[PDB]
Amino acid sequence: YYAEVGQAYETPSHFPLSYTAPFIYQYTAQCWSREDLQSYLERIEQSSGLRTIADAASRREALYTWWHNAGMNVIPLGVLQHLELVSRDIVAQNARKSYRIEQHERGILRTPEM
Amino acid sequence: NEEKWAQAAMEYIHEKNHVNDARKRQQDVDQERSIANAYDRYSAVSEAKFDERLSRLIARMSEALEEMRNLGLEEALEEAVLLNSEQPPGHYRRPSLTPPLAGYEPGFGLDVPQLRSQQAEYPPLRRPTDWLEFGEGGADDFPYVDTHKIEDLTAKHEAQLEEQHGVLREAAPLTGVEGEGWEAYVALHRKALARQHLIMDLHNDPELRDKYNADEAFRAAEWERRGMGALSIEAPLERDLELHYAQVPAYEAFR
Amino acid sequence: RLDATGRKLQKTMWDPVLQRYTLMKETKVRGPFLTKSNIARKVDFPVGA
Amino acid sequence: MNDIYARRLAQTSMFHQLMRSHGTLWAATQVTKEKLNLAFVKEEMMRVNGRRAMPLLIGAAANENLNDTHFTHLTEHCAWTESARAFAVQRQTPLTQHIASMGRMAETITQAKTASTSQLLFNEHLARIDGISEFEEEPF
Amino acid sequence: MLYGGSRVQYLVQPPFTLHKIRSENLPPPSLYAERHDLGLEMQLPRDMHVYNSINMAIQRQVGGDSSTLGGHADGFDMGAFFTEQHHPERHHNSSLPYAKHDTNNVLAMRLFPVNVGVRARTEAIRIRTDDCLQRLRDADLCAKMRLPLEHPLPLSRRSQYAAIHRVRAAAHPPPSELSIVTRPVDRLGASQRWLPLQTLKPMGHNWSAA
Amino acid sequence: TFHSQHRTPIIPQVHVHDEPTAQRIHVGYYLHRHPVVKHSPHPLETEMGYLLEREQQRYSRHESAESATAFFASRGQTIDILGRTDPNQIKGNFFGLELYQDAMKVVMQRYTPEKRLTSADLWQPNALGDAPPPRHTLHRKLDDFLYLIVQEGATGKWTIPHTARKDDESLRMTADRAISSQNSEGLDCYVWSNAPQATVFLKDDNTRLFIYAATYLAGRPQFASFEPKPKDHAWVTRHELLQYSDTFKSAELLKALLDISADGTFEA
Amino acid sequence: INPSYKWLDVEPDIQKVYRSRCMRAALQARGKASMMVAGNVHYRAELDHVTEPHWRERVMRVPKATERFQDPNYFTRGLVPSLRPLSRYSYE
Amino acid sequence: HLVAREWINVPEMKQGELVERNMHFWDTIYNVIPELGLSYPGQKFQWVHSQEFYYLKKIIITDHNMNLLGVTPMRKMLVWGPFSYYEQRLRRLSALLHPDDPVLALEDPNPAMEDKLHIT
Amino acid sequence: MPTTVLYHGDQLGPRPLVILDHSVARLEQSATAVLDACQEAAKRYEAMLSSLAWDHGAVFVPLQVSIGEINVMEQSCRHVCAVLDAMDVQWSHVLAHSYGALVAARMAASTAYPHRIGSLLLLDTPLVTEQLVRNTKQREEIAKAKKDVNVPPAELSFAIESLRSALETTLPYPAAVDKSLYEDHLFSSASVFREKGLVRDEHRYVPVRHLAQVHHPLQLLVPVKQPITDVAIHREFFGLRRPAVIKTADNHEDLFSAKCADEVADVVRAWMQRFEPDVVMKRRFEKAAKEMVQLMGSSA
Amino acid sequence: QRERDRKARQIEKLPRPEALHDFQYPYEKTILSDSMFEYPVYETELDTPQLFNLTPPPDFFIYWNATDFDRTAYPPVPEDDHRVLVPSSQSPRWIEHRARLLQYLRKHEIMPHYVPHIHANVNLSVVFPGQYNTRARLTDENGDKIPPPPAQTKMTPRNFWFTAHCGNYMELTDVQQPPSVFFFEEAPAAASAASDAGEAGDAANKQSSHAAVNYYTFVMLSPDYPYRVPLLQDRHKADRGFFLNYMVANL
Amino acid sequence: HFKKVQDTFWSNRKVLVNRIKSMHNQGTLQSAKDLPIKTINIKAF
Amino acid sequence: VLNKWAAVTKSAPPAAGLRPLARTVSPNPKLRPADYKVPYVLRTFIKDRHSSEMQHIENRGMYREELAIERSRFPRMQKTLTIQTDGSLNEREFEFAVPPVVMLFQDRLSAHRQRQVALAKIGKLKRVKSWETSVRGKESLNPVCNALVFPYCVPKKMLVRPRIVDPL
C-alpha cells in the first residue's frame, strides 16, 4: 500500500508519529475517521516509548509488545501494521532522498524525472 | 597383451559401495554392536589413563624448559629447544610376537644373495623442503634457511593446499568418519601453516608483537581472523541409550 | 546406429493396450505385427488346481 | 588384532615421539602465546600421523606434499607398520599404489606390470616396514 | 585418528541429531490443497472459456505449480532444461505420463477391462460416468429434500415436484427413514426386473483415424 | 614408522660460548628398555579380533575373490613375476628362487619360536615379602618397559645416574657423556630429546636435576664405574617403581619419575 | 548486472497493481508522487546502490573451490541444510 | 501392496494323514525379493524397491503381536483420527467409482478355460 | 585388602589364576578365624588345582561382606583389583563358584575395571534366571507402557499383574553361606524393587542390560546330571557357545571330587590355553608348519 | 606460432582418457544425508499434527494387525506440560508457551479473524473426562452401560490429550461429558510489587476474585456448526454467530 | 553401454600416448602441464 | 497432448510413480555440463541394478546399525608369519596370495649391522662424541630460523652450525 505506490512522503524520519497520519488514512478511510486516527496515533506516542517515524521502524517488536499488553482494546492492530508499513517507507525514501542529495554533490546530477 | 593386464588391474582399484551382508540378522548385528561397545568401554580406561599421563609428561617438560630460563641458561634453551633430528638408529628395535632367538641367523645360515638385495620403494618422498636445498638457489645453511624464504614457502602451500583441497572436495568427496577424518587432517594443516603465517607476521612486524601480547580477547580475536581455532573432538555418548524412533537406520531393518 | 548391438534392440515401454510396461523387441517397421509366429505355446500356470 | 597391536604400540611411541617434539612446540607456543597442553599436542599429533590417503587416481591425490616434512617424519609414530590396514589408510595398499600411477599415467603399463608383481611388492613393502630403502640424495 | 587409521575405538556410530519441525510454522489447512493432493482422473481444463486455461506448449512443466512463485532468479542453464525437457527417453514414446490433461476419465481408465477396444471403451467409461453423475445428483436432490436416497429417481419425482426450489442446507432423514433398499421399485413394495447399466462387448473398433 | 633418516640432516648440539655462571645443576638419564614383545592380548581383545577380521573380511573390496591373484586369475592376467595363475602353487614356491625353498624346508623342521614368558617372571613368594627383590635380569619381562633405578653406596636410597653440568656444555651433551663416561663409552644409548624431560629442586643440596629419557640399545651397564658410588641397580617396570618408594630418595623425585615413565600397558 | 538479459515477470494479482497505478497516476497528477520509485525506468541504476552499496563486489567476487563445495560432512552432520554445488552463479 | 504374514498355517499330509505345518512365509518373500537382504543405507527411500517387481511398494505384514508398545510410526500406518480437515476425502472419491467396477479377485479352483485365471 | 591368600603352586607367574569363592566372612572379626573359613573352601579347590598343573601359579582371594548397603559390591571389586596390584598382574583368568562370580561379572560388566578380568569361568553359579530375565524385559516395556498413553489399560493392567503374579525369585545360591547375602542385600526382595514388580533397582548387583554386555570370554561348567544354572537360558544371553559339560559329575559339589578333578581341570586348562599368548602362538606357528609342508608335498 | 598453436589446438583435439576415482560428483554420484531422509519430528505435538499432515510410513514392511484398530493413536505426552504452568509474566517456559499458543491460533484462522484481540493472560486447560474410548458403546463383558466418568479433579498425563489445546483433536466419544475447566491466573497482584499496600488486598473481600477481572466466564462456541467451511468462503460472504456449546459463569 | 565405454578408454588412451609421442617427436616441447591429463610424465614413456 | 474431445483418444498413460526418469547427462556434447568429463571409471560390471545404482550414491555418512568399520577400501588381507633375521617372529598381512611363514633376509637390524661393519671399513664405527666435540664451528646472524621444523618454525637470532656427515 505504501512502497509500491511511491508517494512523496516529505516527512523526515525524525518527525513525531502524529505526522504519518495523513498518509495512513488515505488507505484506511471507510475504517476510521481521520480525526479518529489522531486519537490512535497519539496514544501510541504517549503510552509507548516510540515517538518518531525512525523509531517505529527500528522498534517494531518493542511497539507490538506494548500494544499487546497495553493497547488491544482501543488501537486496532490494523493501524499498527499500517503504521509499520509507512514507517518502513518514510525511512526508506529518506534514505533514497538523502542519498540522491549526496550524489548530487559528488556530481551525478539527475533531473526531477531522474 | 599389456593393456589387457591393466584392464584387469584397474579393476582391482575400484572401490564400490557394496551392500550389507545378506546373512546378517538383528540377533548378531546387535551382538557385534554389543561387542564394540563392550570394547570402547574397556579401552576407555586404557585411554583415559594415557592422555592423563601426557597431562603429566607435558607438565614436566614445560616446567623444565621454563626452569632453564630462570636458571639463566638462556642460550642453553636456544640449543636445547632445538629439534632433535637424529632418528632412532636401525639398532632400535620394534617388538614382535616372540622374543629374539638365542643366536639365530637368517635361515640358520641358508643365505640367499637375492632376497637380501637393496631395492626400492614406490614413494619418491618429495617434501615441502626439497624446493629449498635440492632446488635452485642452493641454500648453503639449509636447515637454517633465511626467514624470508619461509614467509614465501609457507605462502606457497596456502596457495597450494587451498588448491589441492579445492579439487579433492569435488573430484574425490567422501563423508562419514573418513570424511571428518580428512577435513580435520586438512584443517589442521591450514591451521598449522596459519600459525606459521602468524609468527612471521608476528616476527617481521615490530608493532603488533606488543599489543598482541597485551591482552587475551585480542589474540582469541586475532586467532579467529587467522582461521586458527580449537578443534573439538566429538564426545562419545557410549552410554546405553534408547535412540528415538526416527533416528533408526535409513534402510530396511535386518531379519 | 552403428552396430554397437549385434543383439536385436530391446526396450521397456508402456504397452498402451495392456496399460503395462512390457518388453519392446525391435523389428522391421513393414510387416504384419501379429503373425501366426507370435502365438505363444500353451502352458499351465503355477496357479489353479 | 593387528590393529589392537598397532594402537597399543602407538601410545608407547606417541609418548616418546612427543618427548623429542615438546621442545619445538614449546618454542612456537611461546610467541603465539597459545596454551601448550593436551588440547594442543593432540591436534598436532593428529595432523602428522593420521593422513587419509585420497584415491590415488586424482593426481592431486598422489601429490600430497605435507606429511613428509623433516618434521612429520620425527613426531610420526609407528602405526602403519603393525597392520597393513592402518597402512591402507595413510598410504594406499602396496599394489594399488602402483596400478594407480599407471592409471593416472605417471608410469607406463609396462612400467607397472613388471614392477607391480607379487614378489617385488613383497620385498619392497617389507622395506618401508623396516625403513631400509633406497634414497635419492639429490632429488630431481 | 591420531592412531594411523586403525579404527578400533568408538566404532559404533552415534545416531545423528534430529531436525525438528515447528508444526505452528506450517501453512493453514487449505481446502484446495486437500482436494488435489490425492491425485485422480483430472480437474476441469481450468477453462469453460478457453482463456486462462494453460498452453499445450508448457503442459509438460506443471503438476503442483498452481501455487504462485529456481535456486536463483533464473537462467535455465540449458541443462536439466533441454536435458530433462526432452530426455533421450520421453521421445519416440506414445503415452507420456499423466501430466495435467483433462483426457478421458483416467480414474476409470484404470478400473476398466482392457478387453474392450478403445473407441468402445471411451464410449463406456462415459456411460459409467453418466450414471455416476446421476447417482451424485440424486443424492444431492434426495438429501437436500431430507428424503431417503432413491436412485433411478422417477422423472416425476425428479424435478422434485417442480424442483421444489430447495426449499429456498441439506439434512439427513431420521434413521427411521434409512434402509438398504433404494430402488423405488423396491422401496415401496412397478416390475422389479433388473438389468445392467451398459453392455460391454469385447469387440474392437474397426476405424482407426490413421 | 620410525623411518630411516631419508635426507633429514642432523643438527648437532654445540658447546656454549658465553659462560652464564653455571650453578648447582646435575643431569641424570632415566634409562629404559624398549618392549621386547607386544602387549599381551587381553581375552576381550581376542574376542575383538574375531570381530574385525570377520567384518574386514566379509566387507572386502572384492568380496568373493579370495586374494589379488585369485582376482587377477579370473581374467587369466597374472601379477607374480613368473606368471602363475593357480594361487595354491604360488604359495608353495612363492619366490621363483629354489634356494629359498631349501632355506625354508630346514626352518619348518628346526625352528621353534621363543617363549614369551621368562622364568625370571615366575616370581615365587617364598623368596620373601621384604623390600624389593634384586631384579637384575634385563630379560625380566618382555611386555613392559624396564627402567633403571640405582641406589648409592652412600645412603642406600635409590637414584638415577646423575652428574653435574660443566660450564660450556649443553644439557644434552652433559646427558650424553653422563652415560658414556660412567660406562667408558660401553653403552649404546639414545637420548630422545635435546632438552630435559623433568626437573626437581632439592633443598638438601639446593641441586637442580634434569632427568633425561634414554633407551638402552646395547652395552653392559658397568655400575661400580657409575658416579653416585652405587650399591646395586634395578631394572623395574613403571609399575613396581612404587615398591621402592619406602627406600627411595625423594618423594619429590619418585612421582616426578613415574610421570615421565612410559609404559607398554597404560592400564595404570 | 547486464541490461541485455531480461526476464518476463507475471505477477498474478491484477488488482494489486491496478489499484496502485490508479493511485500512482492520481498522486503524480497532483504532483505529490516521488520519482525515485523502484519502478522508474531511469532510476533503477541508482536504486540498487542506495540499499546494497557493494553489489558489484557481491557478484564479481570469485569463489574458491573450497567454499563452493562446502564440507560434505557438514551435510551429514546437518549444519548446511542442503549442498547445492552447481548453483554458483549470481543472477541478479 | 502385498498383504502377507510371516507364518501361514498351510496343511500338509504326513504319513497319509493331514497335519498342520506352520509355514515360514518370510522365507518365501526374500527368495522372491533378493533386494531386501542387500540393504544399503539409502534403500528404504529408494524409488523402486525391487527392480524386478517395480510394482511392489509396501508389504503389509499382518501378524498378531502381544507386546504392549506396538510398532513405531516408521513401520505402522496411521489408522485412527480425522485424516483431513475440510472433508473426509473418501466420500469425495466415493462419488467417482461405480457400483459395477471391481473390488475383488477371487482365484479360480477350476477355470472355465485358460484365460479366466481369476474372477472379478 | 587382606594378606590372607592361598597361592597354590610354588610360583606366581605374570598372570596367574585368581580363584574366587563365596564371600568368605566379614573381617569385623580378626583375620585368623576367617583364614580358617577360606581354608576349607580351598579344600574344594586344593584338589582340582593339583591336576591342573598351572605354569603361572594360582591364587585365592577372600571377600568380605559390607558393614553397609552399597559397599557389598564396589568394595569387593576394588578389594579384588587391589590384590591384582599387590601382585603385579592385570588380565588374570578367574574361576568362580558363588558370590565370587557376581564380583567378576560386576567388574567385567562395569567400566573402571574391565581390564582386570581377562576370562571368567562359572563352576555352577547362575548369573541370570529365566524368571529374572523374562520379567526384566517386560519391566522395560511396561516402563514405556506405564508412560505412553495410547496403550489400553486392559492390556496394561493385565501385563502388570502377570508381572507380579510371576515375579522373580532370588538367584539360586550355589552354596550355604551367602544364602544370607543372596537373600539379605543383593536381592532383598523388599528393597531391590520399589513399586512392586515394576521397577527393580538393579544398580546394587548389576542392571540386566549390562549382563547383556559382558563379552569377556565366558564359560559355564555343568554337572551332567541335575544341575543348578540351566544351560538353555545362559546360551541365549552370553552368546551361542555350548558350555562344556562335566560328563562324570552328578551335581555341584561333585565337580571337586576325585571323579572329575582331572577333567574339570582338563577342560579348564583348555580355557587357559585359549588366551595365554605363548600357548596360542605355538599352536599358531606349528599350524603354519603343518600348513606349509602341504605345499612341499604338492610340489611334485 | 601458427602450426604450434594449431598443434596446441591439436592437443585440445587430442582425447583426454582420464580414469576417475569414481563417478563425477555432482552429475552422477550424489550425497545422501540424514536431513534428506528423516521422519517428520514435530518439536511439539500440541496441534496433534500427525493426524492431519499424514506422511507415508517410509519403511517397506508395514506391520498392521487387526488389534491396531482399538488403539487410540494419540501423540506421546510431552513433559513440562503447559497445563500446570502458571501465567506469570517472567516465567521463561510461559513466554515460550505464550507465543507458541498465539502461533497456533494464527495458523488456524482463529487469532486475527474470529477472536480479534486475544489478551492471552491465563493458562486455560479444559480437561475433558476421558476414557481413551474408540467409540461410544456399553461395557462389553459386564453387559452394562458405561458409567459417565466423573468430573476431572486433577491434571495428569492421562488427561493431557483430552484438554483444550492449540487445535488438538479429541474423539467425540470423550467430549460427550461436560468438560472440567482448570485455569490458573497470575495477573492479579496487590500492586506492581504487591508492596506498599499496607494490608490492602486483604481489605479486598474477594481475594480469589477481588479484582474486576477475577470472576471468570468460560464460554465454548463452535465456529463450524453445520460443517467446517473455509475461512475465505465464510469470512466474508455470511454473517452468522457460533454454536454456543457451553457457558459457565462466575468461575 | 558399459562395455563400449570401458574398451574405448583403452583405444582412447593409445590414441593419446601414440600421438603425443609423435607430438613430442615433432620438436613440440610438451611439458607436463599444457596437455590434457597433467599427471603424465613423458620422460617415463 | 490429447484431450477429451479429440477424434481419437488414448487409454491410461502411466503414472510416473513407477519406472522413473533418471536425470542423467544428455549424450549431446552441448547439453552436458562443463565440469562433466567422460566417466572412464573402470569397474567390474555389476549385473543387477539393485547393486548397480547403489554406486551412484555416497552414503558413508548415513547412520548404520553395524559398526563404522572402514569398508570397501582395505582389499582382503592375508596374514602370514615373517621370521625376522634375528628370529623375532612378527605377523603381517598382505592382499595377494602370500604363503604361510615367509623366511626373511635383509631386515632392519641386518641393515644396521651392515652399515656398522661397512662403517668399520672406514673405522668410524665407534662414535662421534658431543662433549668431546670441542669443535665449535658456528655463527650467529639475525634473520635466520630452523627449516626442519617448517610447520612450527620460529625466526630469531639463531646460531648456525653444520650437520653431521656420515659416509655410507
When computed from its CA atoms, the radius of gyration of chain C, rounded to whole angstroms, is 15
Flag if G73 and L62 touch (Cβ within 8 Å): no
Whether the CA torsion J23, J24, J25, J31 is positive or negative: it is: negative
When computed from its CA atoms, the radius of gyration of chain H, rounded to whole angstroms, is 20
Residue J179 one-letter amino acid:
P
Smallest CA–CA distance, residue L17 to chain G, in Å, is 24
Task: Tell me how far apart the alpha carbons of residues L22 and L52 are, in angstroms, rounded to a whole number.
Answer: 14
The helix or strand, by DSSP H or E, that contains position J139, with its residue range, turns out to be strand J138-139
C-beta of residue G26 within 8 angstroms of C-beta of residue G17: no
Residues in F closer than 8 angstroms to L67, CB to CB, are: 55
Tell me which residue of D109, B10, B16, K44 sits closest to L40, measured CA to CA: B10
Query: Which residue in this structure is represented by grid cell 500440541?
Result: J46
Residue H24 one-letter amino acid:
H
Whether the CA torsion J94, J97, J103, J105 is positive or negative: it is: negative
> Between chain B and chain L, how many beta carbons pairs sit less than 8 Å apart?
183
Q: What CA dihedral angle connects H72, H78, H79 and H84, to 10 degrees?
A: 160
For I40, residues 6+ apart whose C-beta sits below 8 A from its C-beta are none
Nearest to L74 among F11, F61, F169 (CB): F61
Residue J170 one-letter amino acid:
M
E and L touch with 3+ CB pairs <8 Å, answer yes
Flag if L61 and J26 touch (Cβ within 8 Å): no
Distance separating the N- and C-terminal Cα atoms of chain A: 23
In whole angstroms, what separates CA J62 from the centre of its chain? 27
C-beta of residue I93 within 8 angstroms of C-beta of residue I17: yes
Residues in B closer than 8 angstroms to H26, CB to CB, are: 255
* J33 part of contact set with chain G, CB < 8 Å: yes
Burial class (CB in 10 A: 0-12, 13-18, 19+), L136: exposed
All three cell numbers of I137, joined, read 524385559
Smallest CA–CA distance, residue G66 to chain B, in Å, is 5
Flag if B179 and G64 touch (Cβ within 8 Å): no
DSSP C29: S
Tell me which residue of I231, I17, B210, G73 sits closest to L62, measured CA to CA: G73
Residue F128 one-letter amino acid:
L
Tell me which residue of A68, A76, A93, A74 sits closest to A13, measured CA to CA: A93
For I251, residues 6+ apart whose C-beta sits below 8 A from its C-beta are I223, I225, I226, I227
Flag if H107 and C47 touch (Cβ within 8 Å): yes
Flag if C49 and H117 touch (Cβ within 8 Å): no
Whether the CA torsion A36, A42, A46, A52 is positive or negative: it is: positive
C-beta of residue L161 within 8 angstroms of C-beta of residue F13: no
Phi and psi torsions of E84, nearest 5°: -105, -25
K and L touch with 3+ CB pairs <8 Å, answer yes
Residue of chain H with shortest Cα separation from I153: H68
Residue of chain C with shortest Cα separation from L16: C14
Nearest to H42 among L20, L51, L62 (CB): L62
Smallest CA–CA distance, residue K23 to chain B, in Å, is 22
Task: Tell me how far apart the alpha carbons of residues I284 and G36 are, in angstroms, rounded to a whole number.
Answer: 90
Rounded to 10 deg, the angle between the I73-83 and I100-107 helix axes is: 80
G and J touch with 3+ CB pairs <8 Å, answer yes
DSSP J114: I
3-class secondary-structure state, position B210: helix
Residues in B closer than 8 angstroms to G75, CB to CB, are: 175
Flag if E101 and L1 touch (Cβ within 8 Å): yes
3-class secondary-structure state, position F216: coil
DSSP letter for each residue of F33-71 = E--SBPPPPPHHHHHHHHHHHHHHHHT-SSSS--SHHHH
Task: Tell me how far apart the alpha carbons of residues B11 and B17 are, in angstroms, rounded to a whole number.
Answer: 15
Task: Tell me how far apart the alpha carbons of residues D83 and D106 are, in angstroms, rounded to a whole number.
Answer: 28
Residues in J closer than 8 angstroms to I150, CB to CB, are: 71-74, 132
Q: Which residues pair with L81 in a beta bridge?
A: L91
What are chain I's partners, defined as 3 or more CB pairs within 8 angstroms?
B, F, H, J, L
Q: What CA dihedral angle connects L68, L74, L77 and L83, to 10 degrees?
A: -100
3-class secondary-structure state, position J89: coil
C-beta of residue I283 within 8 angstroms of C-beta of residue I277: no
DSSP C9: P
Mutate to test the interface with C, among E114, E116, E121 (most CBs of C within 10 A): E114
DSSP I224: S
**DSSP alpha helices (H): ranges in G28-69?**
44-51, 55-60
Flag if J77 and I149 touch (Cβ within 8 Å): yes
* B86 part of contact set with chain K, CB < 8 Å: no
3-class secondary-structure state, position L21: coil
The answer for I161, left when phi > 0, alpha when psi is -120 to 50, beta otherwise, is alpha
**DSSP alpha helices (H): ranges in chain D?**
3-14, 16-19, 22-31, 38-49, 84-90, 94-103, 109-115, 120-123, 125-128
All three cell numbers of E69, joined, read 512463485
* K38 part of contact set with chain B, CB < 8 Å: no
Query: Which residue in this structure is represented by grid cell 606349509?
Result: I292
**DSSP alpha helices (H): ranges in chain H?**
26-32, 89-96
Task: Tell me how far apart the alpha carbons of residues L45 and E41 are, in angstroms, rounded to a whole number.
Answer: 42
Nearest to J15 among K12, K23, K26 (CB): K12
Smallest CA–CA distance, residue J145 to chain A, in Å, is 49
All three cell numbers of F62, joined, read 572384492
Whether the CA torsion A31, A33, A38, A40 is positive or negative: it is: negative
Distance separating the N- and C-terminal Cα atoms of chain G: 6
C-beta of residue C15 within 8 angstroms of C-beta of residue C22: yes
The residue count for chain H: 120
All three cell numbers of I164, joined, read 507380579
C-beta of residue A83 within 8 angstroms of C-beta of residue A1: no
All three cell numbers of B111, joined, read 643365505
**DSSP alpha helices (H): ranges in chain L?**
49-52, 108-121
Q: What is the 3-state secondary structure (H, E, C) of E98-162?
A: CCCCCCCCHHHHHCCCCCCCCCCCCCCHHHHHHHHHHHHHHHHHHHHCCCCCCCCCCCCCCCCCC
Task: Tell me how far apart the alpha carbons of residues B124 and D135 are, in angstroms, rounded to a whole number.
Answer: 8
Phi and psi torsions of H9, nearest 5°: -75, 95
Tell me which residue of E99, E121, E117, E101 sits closest to E109, measured CA to CA: E121
Rounded to 10 deg, the angle between the I277-297 and F98-105 helix axes is: 130
C-beta of residue E63 within 8 angstroms of C-beta of residue E100: yes
Residue I56 one-letter amino acid:
H
H96-H98-H99 Cα angle (round to 5): 145
Residues in E closer than 8 angstroms to D77, CB to CB, are: 4
Nearest to L11 among C12, C16, C21 (CB): C16
DSSP B20: P
The residue count for chain G: 92
DSSP J203: S
Report CA-CA distances (Å) from B144 to B139, I74, L145: 9, 59, 5
Nearest to J34 among L25, L33, L63 (CB): L63
3-class secondary-structure state, position F218: strand
**DSSP alpha helices (H): ranges in I52-166?**
73-83, 100-107, 130-147, 153-164
Interface of F with L in 70-99 (CB under 8 A): 70, 79, 87, 90-92, 94
The answer for I253, left when phi > 0, alpha when psi is -120 to 50, beta otherwise, is left
Quote the longest CA-to-CA distance of chain C.
51
Q: What is the 3-state secondary structure (H, E, C) of chain A?
A: CCCCCCECCCCCCCCEHHHCHHHHHCCCCCCCCHHHHHHHHHHHHHHCCCCECCHHHHCHHHHHHHHHHHCCCCCCHHHHHHHHHHHHHHHHHHHHHHHHHHHHHHCCCCCCCC
Interface of C with H in 22-41 (CB under 8 A): none
C-beta of residue A97 within 8 angstroms of C-beta of residue A13: no
3-class secondary-structure state, position F114: coil
3-class secondary-structure state, position H119: strand
The helix or strand, by DSSP H or E, that contains position H107, with its residue range, turns out to be strand H106-107
Task: Tell me how far apart the alpha carbons of residues I278 and J101 are, in angstroms, rounded to a whole number.
Answer: 71
* K42 part of contact set with chain J, CB < 8 Å: no
Task: Tell me how far apart the alpha carbons of residues D120 and D126 are, in angstroms, rounded to a whole number.
Answer: 10
When computed from its CA atoms, the radius of gyration of chain E, rounded to whole angstroms, is 28
Distance separating the N- and C-terminal Cα atoms of chain H: 18
Smallest CA–CA distance, residue B8 to chain G, in Å, is 32
Task: Tell me how far apart the alpha carbons of residues L35 and L33 are, in angstroms, rounded to a whole number.
Answer: 6
Flag if F47 and I216 touch (Cβ within 8 Å): yes
The residue count for chain B: 255
For F38, residues 6+ apart whose C-beta sits below 8 A from its C-beta are B95, B96, B97, D5, D8, D9, F143
* D95 part of contact set with chain L, CB < 8 Å: yes
Task: Tell me how far apart the alpha carbons of residues I76 and I80 are, in angstroms, rounded to a whole number.
Answer: 6
Rounded to 10 deg, the angle between the J2-11 and K2-25 helix axes is: 160
For L7, residues 6+ apart whose C-beta sits below 8 A from its C-beta are E209
Mutate to test the interface with E, among D1, D49, D128 (most CBs of E within 10 A): D49
Report CA-CA distances (Å) from J205 to J186, J191, J210: 18, 16, 6
